[PDB]
Subunit: 495 residues, 2 copies
Amino acid sequence: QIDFRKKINWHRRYRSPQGVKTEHEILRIFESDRGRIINSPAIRRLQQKTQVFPLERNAAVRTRLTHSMEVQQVGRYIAKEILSRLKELKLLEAYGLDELTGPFESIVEMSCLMHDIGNPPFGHFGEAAINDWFRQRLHPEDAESQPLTDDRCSVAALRLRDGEEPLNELRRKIRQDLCHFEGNAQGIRLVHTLMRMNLTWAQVGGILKYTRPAWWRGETPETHHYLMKKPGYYLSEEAYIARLRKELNLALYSRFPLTWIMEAADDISYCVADLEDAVEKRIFTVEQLYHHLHEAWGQHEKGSLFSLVVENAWEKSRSTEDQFFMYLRVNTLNKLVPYAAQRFIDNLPAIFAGTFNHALLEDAECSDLLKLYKNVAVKHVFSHPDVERLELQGYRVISGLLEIYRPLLSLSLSDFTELVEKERVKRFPIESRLFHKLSTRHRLAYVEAVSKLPSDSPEFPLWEYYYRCRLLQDYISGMTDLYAWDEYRRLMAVE
Amino acid sequence: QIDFRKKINWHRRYRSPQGVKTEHEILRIFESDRGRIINSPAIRRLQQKTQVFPLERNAAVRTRLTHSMEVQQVGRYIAKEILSRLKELKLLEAYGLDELTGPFESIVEMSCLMHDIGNPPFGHFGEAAINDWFRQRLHPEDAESQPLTDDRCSVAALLNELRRKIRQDLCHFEGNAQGIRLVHTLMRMNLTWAQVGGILKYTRPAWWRGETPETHHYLMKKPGYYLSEEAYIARLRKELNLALYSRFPLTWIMEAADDISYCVADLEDAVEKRIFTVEQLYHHLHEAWGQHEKGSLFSLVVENAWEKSRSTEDQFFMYLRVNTLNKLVPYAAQRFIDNLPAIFAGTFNHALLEDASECSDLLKLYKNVAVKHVFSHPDVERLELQGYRVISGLLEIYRPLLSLSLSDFTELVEKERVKRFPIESRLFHKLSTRHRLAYVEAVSKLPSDSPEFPLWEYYYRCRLLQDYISGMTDLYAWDEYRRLMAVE
Ligand SMILES: [Mn+2]
Ligand SMILES: [Mn+2]
């Protein structure tokens, strides 16, 4: 049975409010969350994180922030559409929404905003350089089966010991979790353990995009593959994630019903904006682009969504660029938003369950239009040398930075712990200074996770390392494209 | 009589919608406006326009954009508060709001967002360098009375009343006035009248020469619009039911949010730039209050937030922000409702937080601390001075286009390639196509025959230049300065 009272959890993890609360009181909690998000430095960082194009000396181009604001307004429209349609169906009171109208909407907007929140400096390329650097040092493939006589792992504790141990399973999970860094998973890690925001369960639900644990190694459940497409959370969050499922009434590997709305907007905004920027960076004319889109459609009919959207917007522009993109955007939303709004309502039971193994804008006419934009963007924009140059640049910056911090990892627990207590250590001065370079928040978080472990435990050293790596990963992922590059040069000694 | 149906004008200037429209249809028009604003490049430019502190290699510091988002959430709260209070008073249906709930709120947020949108690269300092550069070339003081035997104006053409108005308008550039110019004539957004009302902060015309309006002193504190907009501005007044020099009732809400967000954010950034500790700051605030009582708003806000803190800094600012809004927002929400007739009239000669209000005092306290410690910092001041030269120098680089005859200038507008003026050609190409387009359009609307026609051309010519510059980000203007000075 569909009841949103049960999904829109206004309680918190720590210092949580409890007992009754009016429609207004509840609105205020959700409005509190907005203020928390909007004033966050993690949200400010996004104006300095690159979105497709390099951070040029004129802000004409979209950054991760300006894009996420655009995504949020799309999300607002979809949510608002779902609501209006449902009030016309009178199912609003029936689904326990008549009083959670505003909250619903705000959650969407705020999750929209926070997509890309945990992404590393150089995005998907950052992810690569991180995962790759860890892979050459851990080799999680060497953990999959029985203890290999020749384990490629550089860490003594994480190397599968031959002797009959269930500790071998702990090593397996750590190796896969650290080598499978994902922005969404880092986003969850960020809002809770790092940024220490203390948001409503419902909000944190909306930013939980995937249900796959980072430590996952096998084949994906056939009836869960879509939902477990990448990883959604780390081993460090597993505890809190369980807490989240129970609070939001979610089964293992079940998604929060609103996440689907936020996802949709992101999928829409996704290309069109970069395509606008492409003509702005003079890659081709607006006319040239129209012809690339005509070429891309192929199977042309005079009543298709191409004619209704792209052909339509092209005619509006002639008796230019502004008008073109302005109406192209309009045209798209005006057809796509209703579709996804409907799709949501249509498949609401499975969505409420968070079991629905599909996207609002599927694969089989809306999905086609999007794909068309994507193809054009791939073949002409994403392929541009200045883009690719920066993509490759990013990779080295992160890889090199990770190597600069290798000495802290290439250490014994006894030594590392020593550095954590005494800030000034005799024999390890480089390591000292390098550890000071780390941000006070990720540093704090490490210690806290460590102090919660049992000293006596044989798993304790493995955990320390898992956390040690997490700590390093947090520092790096936390950086902006600029800061990471600047630091790379500074630590390579060229400034 | 108070009816918001009459103030929340969902019609547009060009391609305007008309006839009935449902609550939903109306919401959609206001939601359309949001999309227009949010996708605007003029709104993107703000992530590259400096807010107090220089850009820095880490975005830990607020930019004009990140501040305006903060302002918008404050505005949201105030608007939402006014509404909730009014629903409790049941006056919502009574004031024609029961169906314009969402719109009201969106307008606030969108106007909040668009405050500073018309600000130049080096904001306040940019204004100076512009106005100063024009003043040495026009001397509008020399126009005030009778034609001076020794007129300091560099322009032959600068009917005596038209000359007066042009000189004052061009020499009195203001971000808010430029903002109005921007959304309509430059950005060609075509927004709902109501939205454009919300960004009209001042009722003073830029061409005004005759110190202080007595009865309308506060509303005409700074200029609100240019001579180039006077026509459209008249159109706006009539559409929004405003008397000459009357303000849009919602503008007051947006304004308030800005007055609040104004300092606290830079104070957070001050501790972030290590200017002083969070502890050092608390002591500067204790020093600043002086007249200490154990139940005052200082104790309730600052003392309160200080105790909560004992990350420390995060918690401190987080709850300090909370504490402030939790007391100030209700006040301004009330003030609005309390003085609603005069606000609806847009005649109310005061601010929501203004009088001897404990609220106004708290704000002033933040401001004083910011002035005495943050705004006074050398790296700030250095950049402020730097900005001035960049703009002044840039204005001088473009002096050749102004130091020209109409006959010559016009020639350059038709033929892109002109023989004798090659520097001027290339310099004119440097200007953005939008401001270029806008100039021509304003010019083509004038009567060729008219004796005022040459004066207008110049007014517009200067406006065109001003648009280019004001349109730039701190970075682009600096980059260009160096590029045109030949150091890259
Ligand atoms: Mn996105
Ligand atoms: Mn401001």
